[PDB]
Design a protein around this ligand. Sequence first.
Ligand SMILES: O=c1cnn([C@@H]2O[C@H](COP(=O)(O)O)[C@@H](O)[C@H]2O)c(=O)[nH]1
Ligand SMILES: O=c1cnn([C@@H]2O[C@H](COP(=O)(O)O)[C@@H](O)[C@H]2O)c(=O)[nH]1
Lengths: 252, 260
Amino acid sequence: KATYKERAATHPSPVAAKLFNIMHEKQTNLCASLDVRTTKELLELVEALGPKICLLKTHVDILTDFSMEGTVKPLKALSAKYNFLLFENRKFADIGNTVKLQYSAGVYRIAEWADITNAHGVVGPGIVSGLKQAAEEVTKEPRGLLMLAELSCKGSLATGEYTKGTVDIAKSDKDFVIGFIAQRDMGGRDEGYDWLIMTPGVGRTVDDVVSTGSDIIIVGRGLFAKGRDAKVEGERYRKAGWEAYLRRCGQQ
Amino acid sequence: KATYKERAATHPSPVAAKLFNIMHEKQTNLCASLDVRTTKELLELVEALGPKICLLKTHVDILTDFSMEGTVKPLKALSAKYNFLLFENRKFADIGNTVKLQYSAGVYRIAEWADITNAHGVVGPGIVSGLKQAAEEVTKEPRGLLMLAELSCKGSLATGEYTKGTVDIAKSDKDFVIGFIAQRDMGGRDEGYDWLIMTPGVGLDDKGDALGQQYRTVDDVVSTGSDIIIVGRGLFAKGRDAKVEGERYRKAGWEAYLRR
Ligand SMILES: O=c1cnn([C@@H]2O[C@H](COP(=O)(O)O)[C@@H](O)[C@H]2O)c(=O)[nH]1
Ligand SMILES: O=c1cnn([C@@H]2O[C@H](COP(=O)(O)O)[C@@H](O)[C@H]2O)c(=O)[nH]1
């Protein structure tokens, strides 16, 4: 693949280009996935990890005290201060006005602040066109979507065929669908697609996933649980992921 | 398949047994799927459709004025008065505490009032065990789950292999997973399973109605294996009389069932 810097200069999606630039500038391909109960704990961890991440994956549905004023406002401020994007967990899986409103409205109003979101492909391309239309009506700010091509939960049904079908759906909109949550490269280069591959469950080792084609490593509890120091772990994983990236052979 | 009455007598799920009995007693296998924007319109439609349905499928996420006091309270009252169950649309698709709270909390607190809910099987059996645990913690009332085995939306990935995988996940809990949202019979009888097959997208081939003719007919789906017909806008859109349409579809669905 091309370097993050190169991909930022050519990508059709403004959000993807913005993310690739952050990665190049901050020398990080680390995404911190934080699943905590309170806004206080969330903001604490984000403050500590901000300098070392390119992306923050939030889990607003498990927060007990989510609010636009108390959660989103300070989170957006941290995003701006430390320069990283916001990716909300909510795994959309519907179409039409139902999915548009689950994304744009409700108490969470995800589309108003989440730079990136993800969707299950099982419901068909309607989830892509629906979320795209909702994003456009909500804000002029760049928005992008990741398809959940390969899941890692036990007994998941994201088989080869399902993944192939998901990749095909992604090809319907290279402007809005910026990549996948997956465990391996999804190809596409020969066809003019440049997909971001974000891989969770990293601790498989960083070297393993980055070598197989992962562009971003999504690390969760390994960064803050069990009395760990998030600032220290943020640097550990950032260094590991960046060095693995530098060792990978780029397109010459 | 055996009759609805017979199936109710031997079903392991209290919710499915309750539903099958409602179907037999009211002579209906009709589920009204309402996707209106206001609670006022919803309550009006439910009142009109109550006597003719066995199940009401709500779409709370599109309501512009949802409230536990103004929406759920009256809905439960109608459910008790007219004897039908509540099925909320929310297509759950995650696991662990995330899916548990999406089902139990938030402003909607779905588990507190929805007799039946549905889940995508793609995430694995964890969605079944998680929703089940949440249901037990939230209320003493019995709860049931439907797996989204076959989707009708354009370009969906509910292929034969995906459907088989979803059916296998349902087999993991016969007490909680009562059936599927599907377009055909899912079998299981030889294995000791009695799944409710609920099928959306049904029409009556009305004269001059190209829109409704895009859908399979009631006779087609029921004679093929569907147990419940999920009818949408054909019940109330275009200035239609919901009570009249409710009876039309109930009649068609029941007659097709008896023919079966
Ligand atoms: O301590 C943990 C537990 N889970 N995960 C991983 O996170 C993903 C699930 O995250 P999600 O709830 O955001 O989908 C899976 O890949 C799982 O291995 C972690 O990173 N850390
Ligand atoms: O007027 C309509 C529009 N859609 N549907 C059908 O309803 C389902 C969508 O329902 P859901 O939003 O509750 O999933 C699909 O099968 C679709 O063909 C109807 O029954 N009538």
